[PDB]
Structure formats: structure tokens, C-alpha cells
Amino acid sequence: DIVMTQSHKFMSTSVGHRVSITCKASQDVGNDVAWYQQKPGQSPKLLIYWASTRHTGVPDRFTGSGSGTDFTLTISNVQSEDLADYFCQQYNRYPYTFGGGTKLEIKRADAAPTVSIFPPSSEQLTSGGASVVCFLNNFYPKDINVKWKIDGSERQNGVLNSWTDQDSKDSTYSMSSTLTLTKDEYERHNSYTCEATHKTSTSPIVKSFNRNE
């Protein structure tokens, strides 16, 4: 098989800049090197076939050239509707071994985050579950740390983060965490606190609540 290997993990350009995504595979990539287009919230679609021709509905700015195994998807004057994950492959012979991937995003202005912690509802304690939900949305860029404070002490085990794609209207991000507890551990602690350290704030926003209500 053809071992595909990509170097750039993410590309952040602006309107009018050049997007350079390399595909330095360990084996031969061939002449029929193609590129996908993973639209946000939709299925990935084909963009370039036979390394010179575009798909139906594609402008003339999405071209491609190179020599040998060092190919680069030449993108000039990238607009705001071009945020897609690009993969490099070959359409010569089955099977089609793919690469890692490179996320393309646009560069916009910063935004102040907003911390909002939620108390657990009464319907969760009836079954036997207990979980504290705290969100952190409308922030830029994604370089942020979301941690918990269980009675002042931090917690790392059982904390899993998740994120979405860049919004097409506000150009912000969204990233929170998830922490679930048992029934016996819910009655032992008193208050929970979540925060976020952003580059546009000298002090993090402290938001907490009380379980007694």
C-alpha cells in the first residue's frame, strides 16, 4: 500500500492569502492525485480530479501543480466559504489509502469568552445520576484551557473536552468539558467552579454555584 503522510496539521490564512498544504508521502503518489472537500455539517465532496481539472461548481482559484511526490494544493484568494478539511490521495488503483488531514480556517478578530455553569436538574437525581455541566463558548482562538475546581482542588481524571467547527456568522469557537459523578460522591462536595484563561483577559472569569439552592 501507499503510506500517505502529511506535515501541516492546520492552516490559518486570511482573505487573499495563499493556502499551502503539502503531501509528503513515503511512497509514490502518482499522477492522479485528488483532493477532498469536507464541508462543515455536510459530507465530504470531491474537489480536484486528474490534478488539473476541478469539480462541477468550483471556481478557477482551486488549482494544483508540482513535481514528483512533492505536490501542493495551490489556492489563491481564499474566500470565507472555503473552510474545509483537505485530504491528499490517489485515484489510480484500489485500495485508496489516505493521509492524516489538514484543517483550513480563516483568521478573524478576537472575542471575549463567557463562563456559564449549570446546576444539575431534579430529574437526574431521581434515577441515580449526578453531573455538573459548565460551558465556554464565543471565544477566539482555540488556545484555551478548561479545568474544574472540585472544592478548590483541580481535577484531571475523567475530564474529556470536545469542540466544533468555526461558525460562519460570528467566527467564534466552542469548547467545554464533561465531568460525571456517582450518587455517593454528589452528597460529599459542596460547590463546583469552572474557569478559562484567555489571552484577552488578565484574570479568568470565576463562576460557581451551590447545590442547596
Partner 1 sequence: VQLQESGPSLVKPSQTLSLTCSVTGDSITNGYWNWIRKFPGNKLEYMGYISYSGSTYYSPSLKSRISITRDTSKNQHYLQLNSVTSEDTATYYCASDYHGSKYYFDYWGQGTTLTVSSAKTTPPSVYPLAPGSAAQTNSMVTLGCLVKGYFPEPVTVTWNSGSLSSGVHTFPAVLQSDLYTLSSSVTVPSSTWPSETVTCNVAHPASSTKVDKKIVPRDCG
Partner 2 sequence: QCVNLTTRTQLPPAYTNSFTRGVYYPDKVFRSSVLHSTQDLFLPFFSNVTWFHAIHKRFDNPVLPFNDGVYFASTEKSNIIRGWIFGTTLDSKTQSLLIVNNATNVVIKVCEFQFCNDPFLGVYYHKNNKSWMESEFRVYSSANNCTFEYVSQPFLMDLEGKQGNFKNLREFVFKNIDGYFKIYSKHTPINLVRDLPQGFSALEPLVDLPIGINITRFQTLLALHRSSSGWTAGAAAYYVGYLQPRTFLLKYNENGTITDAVDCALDPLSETKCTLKSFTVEKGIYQTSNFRVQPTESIVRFPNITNLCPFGEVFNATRFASVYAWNRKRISNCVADYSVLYNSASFSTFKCYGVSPTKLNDLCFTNVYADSFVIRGDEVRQIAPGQTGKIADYNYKLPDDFTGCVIAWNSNNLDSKVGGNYNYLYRLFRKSNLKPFERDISTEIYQAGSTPCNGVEGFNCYFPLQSYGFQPTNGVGYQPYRVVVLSFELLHAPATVCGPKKSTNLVKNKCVNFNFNGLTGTGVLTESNKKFLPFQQFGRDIADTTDAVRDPQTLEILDITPCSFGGVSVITPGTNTSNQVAVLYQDVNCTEVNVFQTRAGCLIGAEHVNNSYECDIPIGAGICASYQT
Contact residues: partner 2, CB under 8 A: 2, 27-28, 30-32, 67-69, 90, 92-94
Site for partner 1 contains 97 (CB under 8 A): yes
User: How many angstroms separate the CA atoms of 193 and 136, rounded?
Assistant: 13
User: How many angstroms separate the CA atoms of 53 and 118, rounded?
Assistant: 52
Q: Choose the one of partner 2, partner 1, none that binds residue 27, judging by a C-beta under 5 to 8 angstroms depending on kind.
A: partner 2
Strands (E) across the chain are located at: 10-13, 22-23, 33-38, 44-49, 53-54, 65-67, 70-72, 85-86, 88-90, 102-106, 114-118, 130-139, 146-150, 153-155, 162-163, 173-176, 179-181, 192-196, 207-208
Nearer to partner 1, 14 or 27 (CB): 27
Binding mask 16-55 for partner 1 (x = CB under 8 A): ---------------------------xxxx--xx--x-x
Contacts of residue 164, Cβ cutoff 8 Å, sequence gap at least 6: 173, 174
Site for partner 1 contains 117 (CB under 8 A): yes
Cα separations (Å) of 168 from 50, 53, 106, 171?
A: 31, 28, 10, 6
Residue list 190-209, contact with partner 1 (CB under 8 A): 207-209
Cα separations (Å) of 118 from 85, 131, 133, 151, 196?
A: 33, 10, 5, 16, 16
> Taking the complex as a whole, how short is the minimal distance between the CB of residue 160 and partner 2, in angstroms?
30
Interface residue with partner 1, options 30, 69, 98, 150 (CB under 8 A): 98
Q: Choose the one of partner 1, partner 2, none that binds residue 157, judging by a C-beta under 5 to 8 angstroms depending on kind.
A: none
Site for partner 1 contains 8 (CB under 8 A): no
Binding site for partner 1 (CB under 8 A): 43-46, 49-50, 53, 55-56, 85, 87, 91, 94-98, 100-101, 114, 116-119, 121-124, 127, 129, 131, 133, 135, 137-138, 158, 160, 162-164, 167, 169, 174, 176, 178, 180, 207-213
